[PDB]
């Protein structure tokens, strides 16, 4: 599923529109997931909201699987190419 996963990714990129918030925060948060794995990183601070923001979505997927992950992933992609368009 990987390289599907490398194609959604690629894929992506070429969002015809800027998406919904939830949207964002969700690709990110399962992409880290799928690649990473279970976050290891320090939360942000300060007025850093859009980052911060972005942390905890990862954080609130501890436990998944690279496969869950991606797979996830790449359907919302999915989802989204239709949605918006390429």
């Given at each position: 599923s990987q390289a599907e996963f490398d194609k959604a990714a690629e894929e992506v990129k070429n969002l015809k529109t800027k998406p919904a918030d939830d949207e964002m925060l969700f690709i990110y948060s399962h992409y880290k997931q799928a690649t990473v794995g279970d976050i290891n990183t320090e939360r942000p601070g300060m007025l850093d909201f859009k980052g911060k923001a972005k942390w905890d979505a990862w954080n609130q997927?501890?436990?998944?699987?690279k496969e869950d992950a991606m797979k996830s992933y790449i359907d919302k992609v999915e989802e989204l190419k239709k949605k918006y368009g390429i």
């Open positions: 997927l501890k436990g998944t699987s």
